[PDB]
Amino acid sequence: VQLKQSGPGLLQPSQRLSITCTVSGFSLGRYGVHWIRQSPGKGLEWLGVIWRGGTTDYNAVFMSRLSINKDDSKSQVFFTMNSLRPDDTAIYYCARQGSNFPLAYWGQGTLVTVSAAKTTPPSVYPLAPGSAAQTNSMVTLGCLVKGYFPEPVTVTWNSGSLSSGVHTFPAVLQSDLYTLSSSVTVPSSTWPSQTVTCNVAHPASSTKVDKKIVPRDC
Amino acid sequence: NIVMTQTPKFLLVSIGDSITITCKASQSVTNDAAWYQKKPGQSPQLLIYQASTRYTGVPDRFSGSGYGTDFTFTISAVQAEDLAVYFCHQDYSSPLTFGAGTKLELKRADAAPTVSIFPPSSEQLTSGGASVVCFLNNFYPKDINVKWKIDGSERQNGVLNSWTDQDSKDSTYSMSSTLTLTKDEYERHNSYTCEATHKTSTSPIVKSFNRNE
Numbered sequence: 123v124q125l126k127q128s129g130p131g132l133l134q135p136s137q138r139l140s141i142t143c144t145v146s147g148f149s150l151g152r153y154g155v156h157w158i159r160q161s162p163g164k165g166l167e168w169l170g171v172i173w174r175g176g177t178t179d180y181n182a183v184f185m186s187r188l189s190i191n192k193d194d195s196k197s198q199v200f201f202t203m204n205s206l207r208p209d210d211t212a213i214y215y216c217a218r219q220g221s222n223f224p225l226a227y228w229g230q231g232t233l234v235t236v237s238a239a240k241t242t243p244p245s246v247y248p249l250a251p252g253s254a255a256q257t258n259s260m261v262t263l264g265c266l267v268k269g270y271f272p273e274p275v276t277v278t279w280n281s282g283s284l285s286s287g288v289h290t291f292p293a294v295l296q297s298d299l300y301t302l303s304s305s306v307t308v309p310s311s312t313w314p315s316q317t318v319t320c321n322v323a324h325p326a327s328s329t330k331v332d333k334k335i336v337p338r339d340c
Numbered sequence: 341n342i343v344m345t346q347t348p349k350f351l352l353v354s355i356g357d358s359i360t361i362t363c364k365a366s367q368s369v370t371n372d373a374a375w376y377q378k379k380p381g382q383s384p385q386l387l388i389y390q391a392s393t394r395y396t397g398v399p400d401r402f403s404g405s406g407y408g409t410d411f412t413f414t415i416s417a418v419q420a421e422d423l424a425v426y427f428c429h430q431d432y433s434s435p436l437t438f439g440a441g442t443k444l445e446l447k448r449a450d451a452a453p454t455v456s457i458f459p460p461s462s463e464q465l466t467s468g469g470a471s472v473v474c475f476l477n478n479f480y481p482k483d484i485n486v487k488w489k490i491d492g493s494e495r496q497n498g499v500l501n502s503w504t505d506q507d508s509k510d511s512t513y514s515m516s517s518t519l520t521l522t523k524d525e526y527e528r529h530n531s532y533t534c535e536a537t538h539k540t541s542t543s544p545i546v547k548s549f550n551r552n553e
């Protein structure tokens with residue numbers, strides 16, 4: 123009844139994006155497959171379509187460097203995009219229309235990022251407060267993670283268990299390096315004693331380093 | 341193109357409200373305007389098509405209307421599961437085009453900002469470079485003039501903010517900054533401020549950290 127894509131997602135300038143949409147529960151000879159993308163902070167943007175007979179219609183703004191092919195028997199549609207740039211960064215979808223009725227079936231996604239950075243790992247610098255007033259009986263601690271590529275990362279508190287007021291934040295770019303921060307709000311008197319150990323998990327890098335909390339002696 | 345101009349970008353609401361979104365098309369689209377729902381992680385969900393027709397398995401609280409260029413999308417009673425992005429789409433003509441989004445908020449009427457003023461550590465300075473963090477967990481609304489100032493200044497060099505999704509359980513935001521500073525930049529001004537300009541207290545709710553106290 124549905125559609126499914128490929129990678130690879132992460133590539134550098136002047137290189138071909140090459141997704142493949144594999145289809146089931148309907149024939150390519152009965153329906154078009156459209157290719158759409160969502161750029162971050164933007165609406166959806168339509169790139170092109172291949173209709174049932176093979177006709178193909180590209181958005182003019184990508185027509186210099188876009189191509190859609192298909193094989194009806196194999197239930198495959200092949201998207202390509204011929205010379206990438208840094209603002210070609212988005213989730214690229216394949217999708218399909220009803221008979222009858224508009225776009226209503228979607229591929230799962232392809233996260234793609236355009237940049238020329240080596241896979242460098244983060245550096246976990248933990249945080250605990252700087253003295254002064256300790257009233258209210260609640261104080262928030264931190265765990266700052268700097269300088270990584272690519273994304274994403276899991277920022278857990280005490281091995282994926284403590285997560286009641288855990289607010290991990292969306293990252294931000296720092297010249298081919300991401301930096302994001304994490305917080306946890308826990309009561310005063312037991313941290314101090316039963317302190318929380320912070321850790322991190324990077325998939326394409328593979329480092330899992332832990333850090334415990336100790337303040338300074340003012 | 342056809343450009344689909346969607347309005348308004350945010351509606352703030354509480355449960356049970358009646359709320360209309362609007363889409364203006366640069367060209368007559370006849371009646372080929374459609375409306376979708378976006379819950380993050382999940383893929384888009386077609387609600388209404390051809391302006392007013394309702395898709396497979398969609399409750400009659402979602403309606404719509406319009407012909408030509410002016411279209412309307414009502415929800416007469418909102419709920420937990422209507423708390424998401426919404427967008428118009430036109431398929432009258434290639435290139436196919438979309439509205440920019442209407443995000444739906446929820447109203448936890450006023451709240452106080454849990455400002456947690458921070459410094460670095462010796463444990464940070466392991467490579468000769470540091471960073472002065474500031475968390476602000478749970479506040480309402482997002483209208484917050486924050487600044488990492490030094491003696492009442494606006495030199496914003498190295499200020500490196502963040503924001504979050506309105507967490508569905510407690511329905512209030514959070515914030516995160518990172519005032520980056522080098523080896524020698526780290527000794528100059530004696531103290532610095534994590535500001536807040538909330539209507540919770542109109543006298544500006546400053547919560548500083550100094551190098552001495």
